[PDB]
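Q: What does the assembly look like in three dimensions?
Context provided by user:
Components: three
Sequences:
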Amino acid sequence: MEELDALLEELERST
Amino acid sequence: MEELDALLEELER
Amino acid sequence: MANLDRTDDLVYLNVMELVRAVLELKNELSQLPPEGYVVVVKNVGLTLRKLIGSVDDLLPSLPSSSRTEIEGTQKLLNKDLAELINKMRLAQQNAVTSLSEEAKRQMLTASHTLAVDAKNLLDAVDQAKVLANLAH
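A: Here is the predicted structure of the complete assembly.
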């Protein structure tokens, strides 16, 4: 799940 | 899939 | 810690597509007119449907007891989409009022919850694959 966790982190920074 | 598609429809209106 | 091979993991792939779609909605909600609202929400809706369909293909092969939790996360995704749709409507109706910011802010929040709950689905599906992996 490496690539998704990074997308989930970008999602956090969007917030 | 049923409820979901009903939403995808209400979204088309 | 043991990660799963995601080479041909279509559920994983669809979750990613869905997340990318929310990130898009998130980054461009600013440069969009009241007409562009339905576009970004639709995109999220379409990728959600693709995700759920990929899960449904999968469900019959995993043990019958994982189906409860997994159908539970699927219904939670519908409720999240329905909520994103409500917040889209409010944003369209307050397009020229002073509640415009609060509406689009609630749109970002609703889509955010949808992305996180898509992750909840993926974990329930990974957990089912791996449980069944050491079943027989």
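Follow-up: Residues 2-14 of chain A form the longest helix (13 residues).
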